[PDB]
Amino acid sequence: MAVPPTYADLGKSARDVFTKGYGFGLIKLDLKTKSENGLEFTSSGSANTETTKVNGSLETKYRWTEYGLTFTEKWNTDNTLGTEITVEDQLARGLKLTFDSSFSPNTGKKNAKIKTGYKREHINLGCDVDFDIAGPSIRGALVLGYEGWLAGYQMNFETSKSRVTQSNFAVGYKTDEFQLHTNVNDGTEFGGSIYQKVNKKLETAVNLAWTAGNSNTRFGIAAKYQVDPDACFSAKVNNSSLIGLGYTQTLKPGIKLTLSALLDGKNVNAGGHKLGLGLEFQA
Numbered sequence: 297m298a299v300p301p302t303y304a305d306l307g308k309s310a311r312d313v314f315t316k317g318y319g320f321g322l323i324k325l326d327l328k329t330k331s332e333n334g335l336e337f338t339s340s341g342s343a344n345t346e347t348t349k350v351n352g353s354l355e356t357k358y359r360w361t362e363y364g365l366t367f368t369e370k371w372n373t374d375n376t377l378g379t380e381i382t383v384e385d386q387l388a389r390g391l392k393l394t395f396d397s398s399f400s401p402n403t404g405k406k407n408a409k410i411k412t413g414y415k416r417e418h419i420n421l422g423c424d425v426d427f428d429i430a431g432p433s434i435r436g437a438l439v440l441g442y443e444g445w446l447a448g449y450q451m452n453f454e455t456s457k458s459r460v461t462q463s464n465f466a467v468g469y470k471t472d473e474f475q476l477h478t479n480v481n482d483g484t485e486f487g488g489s490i491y492q493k494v495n496k497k498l499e500t501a502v503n504l505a506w507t508a509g510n511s512n513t514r515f516g517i518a519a520k521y522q523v524d525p526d527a528c529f530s531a532k533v534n535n536s537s538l539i540g541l542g543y544t545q546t547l548k549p550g551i552k553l554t555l556s557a558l559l560d561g562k563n564v565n566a567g568g569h570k571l572g573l574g575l576e577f578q579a
């Protein structure tokens with residue numbers, strides 16, 4: 297509550313209005329299980345309707361909530377294999393330590409990561425260390441909270457160049473009904489968003505972005521409407537004349553079907569329009 301989100305999560309709700317409920321140019325297939333404790337899995341299939349390629353992924357996850365411990369295994373179709381062990385609230389409440397290891401037989405590449413987070417009232421801290429063979433990189437982030445206000449800083453240091461390759465600032469304001477987010481990346485990319493939960497059935501979002509040195513501006517508007525408890529409608533536009541439409545229907549308890557269409561406003565009157573289909577299977 298008084299505990300602020302991580303840097304990456306600043307502006308999440310707004311991003312979510314634009315991203316969720318849409319799966320353009322894909323046939324997506326998701327099998328998920330749920331347990332508060334022990335085993336759960338997430339299985340995913342994806343066909344790209346342009347490239348005809350078919351991707352798959354499995355993720356198994358074991359939670360030992362007795363000791364704030366979680367074990368996760370990942371497997372992709374391109375034989376990428378991943379292991380993730382996380383410890384949360386063990387040494388100190390709000391402390392989180394994650395060891396991650398990855399391997400690709402197809403490219404011989406191995407990768408390992410260590411992520412540490414510490415959060416408490418008004419503060420959310422993070423330090424991620426990537427032990428890439430090109431050289432270690434270190435990402436640090438800090439989010440300060442004051443009476444609904446949020447200020448964040450985020451950086452990335454690459455030891456091989458021994459140079460900062462990323463320096464981002466964010467400032468925002470967050471209640472449960474309304475969220476303001478602004479950020480500037482590398483003193484170069486400016487972003488801003490407003491999120492509003494207008495009522496219990498309607499959420500809206502506006503997003504702005506522009507780039508120093510260019511007079512252009514990108515914006516988008518988006519909404520999500522909960523028509524009943526088993527149907528949800530999403531619509532979005534941007535100033536490149538793109539229109540996104542999405543409908544999500546519960547066919548049966550545990551089963552949701554999403555249809556999505558991306559229209560190019562320049563030529564809605566006949567043209568190439570991306571469709572999407574999503575099927576989520578729960579438990």
Ligand SMILES: Nc1ncnc2c1ncn2[C@@H]1O[C@H](COP(=O)(O)OP(=O)(O)OP(=O)(O)O)[C@@H](O)[C@H]1O
Pocket residue numbers: none
């Ligand atoms: N419709 C949804 N789509 C994606 N994630 C969901 C959805 N509903 C609930 N979740 C939550 O997200 C988790 C799944 O992983 P996921 O990658 O989707 O998280 P995220 O996208 O990073 O952000 P978020 O947790 O808000 O969805 C689940 O544990 C669940 O708590």
